[PDB]
Amino acid sequence: LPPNALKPAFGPPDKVAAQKFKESLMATEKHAKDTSNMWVKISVWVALPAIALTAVNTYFVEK
Amino acid sequence: KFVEGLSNNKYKIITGAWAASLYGSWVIVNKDPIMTKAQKIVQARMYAQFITVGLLLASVGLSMYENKLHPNKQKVNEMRRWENALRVAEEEERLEKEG
Numbered sequence: 001l002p003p004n005a006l007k008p009a010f011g012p013p014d015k016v017a018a019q020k021f022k023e024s025l026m027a028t029e030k031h032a033k034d035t036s037n038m039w040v041k042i043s044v045w046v047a048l049p050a051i052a053l054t055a056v057n058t059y060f061v062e063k
Numbered sequence: 064k065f066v067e068g069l070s071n072n073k074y075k076i077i078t079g080a081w082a083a084s085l086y087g088s089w090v091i092v093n094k095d096p097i098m099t100k101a102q103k104i105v106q107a108r109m110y111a112q113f114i115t116v117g118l119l120l121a122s123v124g125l126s127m128y129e130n131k132l133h134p135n136k137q138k139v140n141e142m143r144r145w146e147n148a149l150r151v152a153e154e155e156e157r158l159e160k161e162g
Contacts, residue, residue, distance in 0.1 A: 028098075031097050035098075
């Protein structure tokens with residue numbers, strides 16, 4: 001039984017770097033949703049009209 | 064006119080253009096910061112090498128823009144090198160015969 005075992009080890013809980021942690025926690029979600037939206041847009045507007053033009057080029061040379 | 068003059072600076076301009084496209088797209092991807100630095104690097108690099116491969120197929124487009132200038136090189140100035148290496152043996156043979 002120590003006397004000083006039951007006192008708090010940290011003191012005051014900070015309230016603005018917890019809010020700033022939680023707003024970044026919920027803002028990288030919204031920016032990740034928009035980033036995913038524009039990257040599927042890029043991956044289907046550019047990447048598959050690239051494989052679609054190179055497969056027809058490589059079928060000829062595979063012949 | 065200008066076409067071969069910077070088409071033998073061909074693979075020295077496209078790597079500089081790659082460095083230009085990555086280190087230029089870096090400020091446009093970094094001006095709106097909420098991503099971590101690694102995601103900014105990979106997206107700026109993802110744009111930049113689409114640019115370099117498009118510019119490289121423009122490179123082969125220039126390559127057959129450009130040698131309807133003079134046909135059948137890779138030998139027609141080995142012609143040059145061998146032709147004057149030949150008669151620089153001639154310039155020595157004479158005044159060692161007459162010297």
